[PDB]
Amino acid sequence: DQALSFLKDFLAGGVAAAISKTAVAPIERVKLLLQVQHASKQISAEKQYKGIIDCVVRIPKEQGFLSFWRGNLANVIRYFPTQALNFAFKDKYKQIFLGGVDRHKQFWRYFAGNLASGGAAGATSLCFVYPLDFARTRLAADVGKGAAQREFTGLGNCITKIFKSDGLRGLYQGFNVSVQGIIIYRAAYFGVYDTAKGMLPDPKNVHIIVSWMIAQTVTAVAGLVSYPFDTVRRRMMMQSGRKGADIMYTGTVDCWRKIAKDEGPKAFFKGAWSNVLRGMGGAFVLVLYDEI
Ligand SMILES: C=C1[C@@H]2CC[C@H]3[C@]4(C)C[C@H](O[C@H]5O[C@H](CO)[C@@H](OS(=O)(=O)O)[C@H](OS(=O)(=O)O)[C@H]5OC(=O)CC(C)C)CC(C(=O)O)(C(=O)O)[C@H]4CC[C@]3(C2)[C@H]1O
C-alpha cells in the first residue's frame, strides 16, 4: 500500500513509455508528414515526400538528423497527466458502464459497456492532454530548416502561438473525430482479439513469439480500421492558425468530404503503413526495454 511503491511504479511506467515512443519517433514523424503534408503551408505539392524512404533520406539533410524527434517532447510528457487522470476516472467508468453485467450471459451489453468505458476514459483524459497531441502533430509537420524558418520552435511556443490566434478551440481541433476513433479502435481491437483467441490459440501454450506476433497483429488491424478517423483528426489539427479563405476544412464532415473528393478514398490511409511499423517497433522496444 506504500505510497512510495505506487510512485515508483508510476514513474517506471512513465520511463518505459518515454523510451519506446522516443525510440519510434522518427518513423512516427514520417507517418505524420505523409498523413498531413497535403494540409501543410510550407510543403508545395512539388516538394511533398514521395514516401517513407524518400522521407527518411530527406529530413536529415533538409532539417537535421535531430529533427526526426521534432515534437517528441509531448510524447514523453503525456503519460503522466494521462495516467494521473485514469487513476481517478478509469475504474469508475468501468463500474458505471459494466457494474452488474454478466460477461458470459450478456455478451453485447458487456461489449457496449466496454466501448463506452474506454470511450469515456479516453475523452476525459483528452480533455486535458489533447493540446499535447495537437502540438506533437503541428511540430512534427513543421519542416522549417532552421529557427528562422520554423513554424513553431517548440512545445510551449506551438501551444501559446496557436492559443493567441485561435484561443482554446485551436488547441482542440479534431477532438470529436478522435473520440469516435477511440471507440472504433477499441471495437476493432476487442472484436478481432476475441475472434482470434477462439481460432488458433487454445489456452495459450504456444511460444512467446507467436503469442507476441498475434498481439501485434491485433494492434495493427485495429489501427488500420480506425486510421481514416486519425487522418481527418490530424488534418483538422492542421487548420489551427489559419484564417479566412485559408481554411481548408470548415468542419469534420467537410474534412471527410474534401479528402475524399480532392485526394481520393485511398488518401485516408496516407502514412498508414508507416503507422503499422511505428506500432510494431514501439512494442518491440518495450520488450527490449523490460529485458534490461
Ligand atoms: C482516430 C484515432 C485513431 C484510433 C484511436 C486513437 C488511439 C489508437 C487510442 C489509444 O489507446 C487507448 O486504447 C487502449 C486499447 O484499447 C487503452 O488501453 S486499455 O484501457 O488498457 O484497454 C488505452 O487506455 S489507457 O487506459 O491506457 O489510457 C487507451 O488510451 C487512451 O484513452 C489514451 C488518451 C491519451 C486518449 C491511445 C493512442 C495509441 O496510439 O495507442 C495513443 O495516443 O497513445 C491513440 C492514437 C490516436 C488515435 C488513432 C486517434 O487519433
Ligand SMILES: CCCCCCCCCCCC(=O)NCCC[N+](C)(C)[O-]
Ligand atoms: C476485422 C476486420 C473487419 C474489416 C475492416 C475493414 C476496414 C476498412 C477501413 C474502413 C475505414 C472506416 O472505418 N471508415 C468509416 C467511414 C465513416 N464516415 C462515413 C462517417 O466517415
